[PDB]
From a paper:
However, because of the intrinsic flexibility and irregularity of loop regions, organizing multiple structured loops at protein functional sites has been very difficult to achieve by de novo protein design. Here we describe a solution to this problem that designs tandem repeat proteins with structured loops (9–14 residues) buttressed by extensive hydrogen bonding interactions. Experimental characterization shows that the designs are monodisperse, highly soluble, folded and thermally stable. Crystal structures are in close agreement with the design models, with the loops structured and buttressed as designed.
The in silico validated designs span a diverse range of shapes with different repeat protein curvatures and loop geometries and adopt multiple loop buttressing strategies using loop–helix hydrogen bond networks and loop–loop bidentate hydrogen bonds. From a fundamental design perspective, the crystal structures presented here show that computational protein design has advanced to the point that proteins with multiple ordered long loops can now be designed. Key to this success was the design of dense networks of hydrogen bonding and nonpolar interactions within and between the loops and between the loops and the underlying secondary structural elements.
Residue numbers in the entry:
A (entry chain H): 3 to 214
B (entry chain A): 2 to 205
Write the structure that this text describes.
């Protein structure tokens, strides 16, 4: 598909070629290009773009926010997962989980774009890992920068409608993971865990009973 | 005064034997058609008097009054009816947390959820314009480590209920303005809570 190869020519192109990437995508989309056409393995233009961010230079990174808004404005489905079952939001959080501090700041901004585009905050991957459960992993095993960022994004997801009780395939609930963060976490990790544990304990039996 | 108010008055200024059967007595009084909103001469509603009992009462009186609040709210007590000074039940609860024991703090957190489920306005301020969010940030700024964590989760519980994080008080002090102050001179844990709330606000 024309869109997918262009994205491949951005990752596999020069830095000066990157200058023409936003314009080329705009002229390709205006020409009637499908912003959702996946390739043989099911990678969508959004997923490949996030994949470029994950493996690209800082120059390729700053380019991708405009390329994502262009794809989202063109009508890309923000919930279309790849063949493995990885949603753009779950791939974004993996970029935060394993990325540099620069990638962390970017994927945080891209997540807001995806939520605005209409991404499902409860859509899990093939293993049942929800966006909330992955953010709790980022808090438990991430840096002090990742702790605060994953903390605010989790509240952002809860406000967006994420349910803090959905478990994964192994039956691991977010509350079970919060107890782990409290038991063996740092002074700051335990504080974040105690906050989230108190929030859950007061609206766990009925999440949304006061959302009026 | 009002039979509901008279019963509540007998609990705080009475012995412990009166307290055990009080929940049953209120259940039969409300079922008999007693108005759970009738205030006295000073404007104290049955809910506001019950919160006064929690703040000044023994631990026995405290856990009894949490069940008594559920009864009054189910009977149709207004969770937004403030006293003559203009202090709403949620704002009085937070003041109880701000100055109360760890036991009173744990109790008042459950009453806030009961009030919010009843339909309490999360943005209703007092006469001074202090909003529930702004007061919770004060509890975070100058409270204990236990009060820090609890006021934090109550702040998120209020945001989930629809609290606006941009409402300022009468002096024009915004919640973001207070969060920066917590970050500049707060502890390592207070600064983390402030940085979290600052990132959340800037992103939505």
């Amino acid at each position: 598909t024309p869109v997918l190869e262009l994205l491949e020519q951005i990752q596999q192109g020069s830095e000066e070629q990157q200058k023409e990437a936003l314009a080329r995508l705009q002229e390709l989309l205006e020409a009637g290009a499908d912003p959702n056409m996946a390739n043989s393995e099911g990678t969508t233009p959004v997923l490949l773009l996030l994949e470029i961010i994950q493996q690209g230079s800082e120059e390729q990174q700053k380019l991708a926010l405009a390329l994502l808004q262009e794809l989202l404005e063109a009508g890309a489905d923000p919930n279309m997962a790849n063949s493995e079952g990885t949603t753009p939001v779950l791939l974004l959080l993996e970029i935060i989980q394993q990325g540099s501090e620069e990638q962390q700041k970017l994927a945080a901004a891209l997540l807001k774009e995806l939520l605005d585009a209409g991404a499902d905050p409860n859509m899990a991957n093939s293993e049942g890992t929800t966006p909330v459960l992955l953010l709790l992993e980022i808090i438990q095993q991430g840096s002090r920068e990742q702790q605060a960022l994953a903390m605010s994004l989790l509240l952002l997801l809860l406000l967006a409608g994420a349910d803090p009780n959905m478990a994964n395939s192994e039956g691991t609930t977010p509350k079970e993971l919060l107890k782990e963060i409290q038991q063996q976490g740092s002074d700051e990790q335990r504080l974040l865990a105690e906050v989230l544990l108190q929030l859950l304990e007061a609206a766990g039996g009925s999440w949304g009973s006061h959302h009026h």
